[PDB]
């Protein structure tokens, strides 16, 4: 064993030699020298975050009260017209035209109806929306189960027509809107660019099941947050089809349950008892729910019925007020069969005022008797539904959302208020979508009274889609440094607009079309002072706090111990809540001034794909410089057609954004002239492989244009690991190779190392760019192999990776976790504290169906 | 195909801003002498550890990657749930609701 002193003089020798090599072939000093030499072709502005959260908060706010006003010339229009309008029973002669969504492109006059005559629309291409649409008319959605030739179906169909004028003007205003759609409380949805239905017109293994009333937004503008205490009667006689068809009854009940609604699931024989690990009303949110599912499956039938002790349990829960709760809309669901106690006294002591519902479901194919049953639900303001069989299941839950809708609709115009959606996956492919929803009610007798039969149900609810696109376009994020970005935020909790929101179903467990809802705290690292941030956010308060907190790379793989400011307002007339994470060397950017005519194209020139020995191998991060410009995956022609609408540019004035344009052309010529003056005149050096630069605007430059093919770095330069870690330490970071990945790999790629730049314009301090060199791995085990080998001598960074050994054996699985090969070493070292961790979850990663 | 899924995942980062760190490995009945040294103005640390072909204490690894587990348990964060807070207004409870409509 070497003294201390002895291998800490080689350790400084091995540091200093990184070091030296590292600032020599990189070329930091000299970028810098570039930056600083021409502050005249830029000027350094700030980002007053204040300020930006300020004006994306009232630019979102904006948006949304544009689609809210939608919302409200749609329902007035629907309410308006509806009340205006005339049963029927004959419409052969008077035939109501419509496109039904779930048609055959097939000129083929023989797909029609009786009663009503069908549209054949002509669909031209949109990539807003993606798909085939036609801005003459609305498509109707119908689903399987319910004919669409009946009464109601075709007075339904006769008097939305008017929707379809309204839709058309809804758009001609707001050029940007998407599907705007009528969910009929007859099953009808009407949605405005008539196109297919998504993927369920007339195709085999494919069984169209959507119904408009079973959507979340539906069911969210349809009526108030409830709390339902599902009781199940797993007695006896329950047993066989009873329970099966009970607990799918339960399962398809939870389904139409919002992270708003509060449940609970209760099954009582002889004694009631709770069917999960949970004690009380809980939040009605993906994974509550499914172990509320998973309870229920796994219940039994076995004993006499007592209704009293299953009723006392039932309102006992539901007035436990130590926990959080929806203090509104209570409810009891009873899935029972059949009986003969009516329980008066129960319901006379617990519900007397009648605060509480009692919803009665006689589920199963029997006979015992329903008088019981259907008194319940008579004397408690509720229901009483009957579900025989696999088929009925999924209709009655719909219809007690039906019963609940009354007391909103008796409030006439508090009621007709704007609500946004969880943000989930649209039904007609987007994406990530939000929908704000506006209930549409009966107006037929008005002001000349009448008897009111049906008149304190709801028509439907309107909806307009807003997809997070949308959202993220008046939150613009190249200003800043990679490392902040805007944030969004519910009443619950769950990011709205976050970089570590994907478009993907939230996961629940292990495996064997609900809401993507990730809570804040579940998509970053959560600290302390970020629960409060949060509990400050949600309360709908501006703030500011800057902290230390825990960053974990883009990687997945290491973590850094970042400097950030999160100032935050509210959305105003809105729950949402908009906030800023932003560095502390990100205060400032750089704004390019090219106002020559002729700088610009003196910097564009050195872009063009035939130079590519006088300057290094370039890519172009694909963003938004403007709209002719299509971004592809293929980024040659991305550069390509980039340089193209380079070509002819002075036209577009006001077509296509100065500021990213500027920017990127004059980060091409720093980059280029960099290469030039400092890498083409020494044009190789034996330790490094790859030497290259990375920068904030987009251009990354790698040199030998050999090793650039070798490069499999994301072009967008805001989406790089490695430069976004590099921008938080102020050193050097070796960025470890993937262990076991099929391409460049490590021998024939390298090691990255990379340093940010650290300029000074008028003593504020920046980092435009980050110099990275791919070290080669033979000269550097050469270098290091002057050393004692056999026994080992290691070289670990940040996350405990094998950048190598000395034993010539562990340098072929290059790259990997050295927990992989010798795990009591670093476990010990853990516990000596020269290794933290953390342990985080990521609910919206895909996973391999285990058995 | 395939399906989502709850993935705990783990990284690791340097704890302590002292930069030497030595000590002898307690492993199985043997002895394993190290030395860690971290490289100034850079993320690496040098592990001089002298001892190999000795017993075995690789019992179980450290797998920092993506393994598939199940989430938090959900009975525990029922009892001290995150903040929240609910609609503002809500319609129930009208006393000129019709209620002979049971069925
Ligand atoms: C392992 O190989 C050699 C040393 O065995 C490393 O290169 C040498 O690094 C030392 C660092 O102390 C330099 O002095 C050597 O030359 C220097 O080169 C720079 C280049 O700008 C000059 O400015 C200096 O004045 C000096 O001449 C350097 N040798 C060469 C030929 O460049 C090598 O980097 C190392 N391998 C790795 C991967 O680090
Ligand atoms: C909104 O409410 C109005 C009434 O409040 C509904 O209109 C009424 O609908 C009922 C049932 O569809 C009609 O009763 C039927 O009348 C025909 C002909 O008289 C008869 O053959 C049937 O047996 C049945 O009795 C009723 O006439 C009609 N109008 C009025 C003034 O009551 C309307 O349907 C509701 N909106 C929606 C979308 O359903
Ligand atoms: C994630 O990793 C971080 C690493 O910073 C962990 O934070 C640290 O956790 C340890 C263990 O709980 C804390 O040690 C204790 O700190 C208190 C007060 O500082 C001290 O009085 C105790 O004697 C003990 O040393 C440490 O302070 C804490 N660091 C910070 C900055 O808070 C964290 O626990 C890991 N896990 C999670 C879920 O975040
Ligand atoms: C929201 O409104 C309040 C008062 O109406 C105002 O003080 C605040 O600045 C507004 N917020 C934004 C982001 O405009
Ligand atoms: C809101 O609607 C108006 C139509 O008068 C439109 O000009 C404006 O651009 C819209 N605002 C946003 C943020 O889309
Ligand atoms: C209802 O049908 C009749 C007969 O075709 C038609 O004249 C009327 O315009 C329809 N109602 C609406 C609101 O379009
Ligand atoms: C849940 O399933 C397990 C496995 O069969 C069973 O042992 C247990 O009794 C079930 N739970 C109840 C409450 O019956
Ligand atoms: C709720 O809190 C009160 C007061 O702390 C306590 O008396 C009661 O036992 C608790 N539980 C229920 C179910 O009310
Ligand atoms: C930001 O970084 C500096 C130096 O890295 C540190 O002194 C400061 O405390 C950090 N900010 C906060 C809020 O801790
Ligand atoms: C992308 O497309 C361009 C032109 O179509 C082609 O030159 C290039 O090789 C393609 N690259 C990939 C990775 O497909
Ligand atoms: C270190 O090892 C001891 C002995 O195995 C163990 O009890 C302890 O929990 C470990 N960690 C710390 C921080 O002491
Ligand atoms: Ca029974």
Same mark, same amino acid.
């Given at each position: ?20 090599? =590292? ?69 052969? $002669? ?7 969504? #779930?048609?055959?492109? @097939?000129?083929? &006059? ?56 309204? %839709?058309? &003007? ?41 119904? !408009? ?64 690990? %949970? ?75 009648? &605060?509480?519902?009692?919803?009665? +479901? ?52 508090? =009621? ?24 549409? +009610? ?26 997070? /696109?949308?959202? &993220? ?77 825990? !960053? #974990? ?38 704004? *390019? #001034? ?9 910097? $564009? ?15 172009? =991060? ?24 380079? @070509? ?24 280029? /002239? ?64 993937? %262990?076991? #990945? ?6 024939? $790629? ?28 033979? $000269? ?56 933290? +961790? ?12 285990? *058995? | ?103």
């Amino acid at each position: 064993f070497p003294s201390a002193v002895t291998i800490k003089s080689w350790v400084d020798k091995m540091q200093e030699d990184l070091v030296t090599l =590292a600032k020599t072939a990189s070329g930091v000093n000299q970028l810098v020298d570039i930056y600083e030499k021409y502050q005249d072709l830029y000027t350094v502005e700030p980002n007053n975050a204040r300020q930006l959260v300020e004006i994306a908060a009232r630019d979102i706010e904006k948006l949304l009260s544009n689609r809210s006003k939608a919302l409200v010339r749609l329902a007035l229009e629907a309410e308006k017209v509806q009340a205006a309008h005339q049963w029927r029973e004959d419409f052969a $002669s008077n035939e109501v035209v419509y496109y039904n969504a #779930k048609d055959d492109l @097939d000129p083929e &006059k023989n797909d029609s109806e009786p009663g009503s005559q069908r549209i054949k629309p002509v669909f031209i291409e949109d990539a807003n929306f993606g798909r085939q649409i036609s801005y003459q008319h609305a498509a109707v959605h119908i689903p399987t189960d319910i004919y669409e030739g009946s009464t109601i179906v075709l007075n339904e169909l006769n008097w939305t027509s008017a929707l379809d004028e309204v %839709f058309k &003007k809804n758009r001609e205003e707001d050029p940007s809107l998407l599907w705007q759609v009528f969910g009929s409380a007859t099953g009808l949805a009407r949605y405005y660019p008539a196109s297919p239905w998504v993927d369920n017109s007339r195709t085999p293994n494919k069984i169209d099941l959507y119904d !408009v009333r079973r959507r979340p937004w539906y069911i969210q503008g349809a009526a108030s947050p409830k709390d339902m205490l599902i009781l199940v009667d797993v007695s006896g006689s329950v047993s066989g089809l009873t329970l099966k068809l009970i607990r799918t009854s339960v399962s398809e009940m939870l389904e139409t349950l919002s992270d708003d609604d509060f449940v609970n699931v209760a099954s009582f024989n002889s004694n009631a008892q709770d069917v999960s690990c %949970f004690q009380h009303l809980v939040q009605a949110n993906v994974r509550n729910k499914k172990v509320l599912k998973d309870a229920v499956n796994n219940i039994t039938a076995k004993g006499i019925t007592d209704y009293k002790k299953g009723f006392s349990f039932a309102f006992e829960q539901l007035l436990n007020y130590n926990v959080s709760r929806a203090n509104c809309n209570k409810i009891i669901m009873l899935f029972t069969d059949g009986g003969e106690e009516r329980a008066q006294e129960i319901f006379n002591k617990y519900n007397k005022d009648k &605060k509480v519902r009692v919803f009665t +479901f006689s589920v199963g194919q029997h006979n015992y008797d329903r008088g019981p049953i259907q008194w319940m639900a008579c004397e408690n303001k509720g229901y009483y539904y009957e579900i025989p069989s696999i088929g009925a299941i999924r209709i009655n839950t719909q219809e007690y959302l039906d019963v609940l809708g009354r007391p909103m609709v008796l409030a006439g115009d508090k =009621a007709k208020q704007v609500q946004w959606t969880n943000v989930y996956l649209d039904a007609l492919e987007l994406g990530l979508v939000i929908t704000g929803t506006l209930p549409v +009610f009966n107006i037929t007798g008005q002001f000349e009274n009448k008897t009111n039969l049906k008149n304190q149900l709801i028509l439907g609810v309107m909806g307009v889609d807003v997809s997070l /696109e949308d959202i &993220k376009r008046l939150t613009p994020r190249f200003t800043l440094c990679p490392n902040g970005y805007y944030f969004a935020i519910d009443p619950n909790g769950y990011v709205l607009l976050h970089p570590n929101l994907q478009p993907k179903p939230i996961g629940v467990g292990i495996p064997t079309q609900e809401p993507v809802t990730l809570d804040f705290l579940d998509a970053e690292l959560e600290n302390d002072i970020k629960v409060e941030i949060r509990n400050k956010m949600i309360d709908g308060e501006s703030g500011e706090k800057t902290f230390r907190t825990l !960053v #974990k790379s883009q990687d997945e793989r290491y973590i850094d111990k970042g400097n950030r400011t999160y100032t935050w307002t509210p959305v105003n007339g809105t729950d949402y809540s908009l906030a800023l994470v932003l560095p502390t060397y990100s205060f400032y950017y750089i704004k *390019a #001034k090219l106002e020559e005519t002729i700088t610009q194209a003196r910097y $564009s020139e050195t872009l063009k794909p035939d130079n590519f020995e006088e300057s290094g191998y370039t890519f172009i =991060a694909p963003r938004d410089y403007c709209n002719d410009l299509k971004i592809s995956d293929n980024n040659t022609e991305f550069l390509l057609n980039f340089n193209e609408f380079i @070509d002819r540019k002075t036209p577009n004035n006001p077509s296509c954004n100065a500021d990213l344009i500027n920017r990127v052309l004059l980060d091409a010529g720093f980059t280029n /002239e960099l290469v030039q003056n400092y890498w083409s005149k020494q044009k190789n050096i034996k330790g490094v492989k790859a030497r290259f630069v990375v920068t904030d605007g987009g251009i990354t430059r790698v040199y030998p244009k050999e090793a650039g093919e070798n490069w499999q770095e994301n072009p967008e330069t805001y989406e790089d690991s490695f430069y976004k870690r590099s921008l938080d330490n102020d050193n050097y970071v070796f960025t470890a190779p993937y %262990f076991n #990945k099929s391409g460049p790999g490590a021998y024939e $790629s390298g090691i990255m190392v990379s340093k940010a730049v650290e300029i000074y314009i008028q003593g504020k301090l920046l980092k435009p760019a980050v110099v990275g060199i791919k070290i080669d791995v033979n $000269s550097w085990i050469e270098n290091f192999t002057k050393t004692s080998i056999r026994m080992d001598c290691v070289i670990l960074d940040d996350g405990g990776f094998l950048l190598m050994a000395n034993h010539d054996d562990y340098t072929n699985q290059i790259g990997r976790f050295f927990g992989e090969i010798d795990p009591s070493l670093m476990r010990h070292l853990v516990n000596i504290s020269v290794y933290a +961790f953390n342990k985080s979850y990521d609910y919206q990663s895909v996973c391999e169906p285990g *058995a | 195909s395939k399906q989502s899924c709850i993935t705990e995942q783990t990284q690791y980062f340097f704890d302590n801003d002292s930069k030497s760190f030595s000590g002898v490995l307690d492993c199985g009945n043997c002895s394993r002498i190290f030395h860690g040294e971290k490289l100034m103005n850079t993320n690496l640390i040098f592990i001089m550890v002298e001892s190999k072909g000795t017993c075995p204490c690789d019992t179980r690894l450290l797998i920092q990657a993506e393994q598939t587990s199940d989430g938090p348990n959900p009975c525990d964060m029922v009892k001290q749930p995150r903040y929240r807070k609910g609609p503002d207004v809500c319609f129930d409870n009208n006393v000129l609701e019709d209620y002979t409509d049971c069925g």
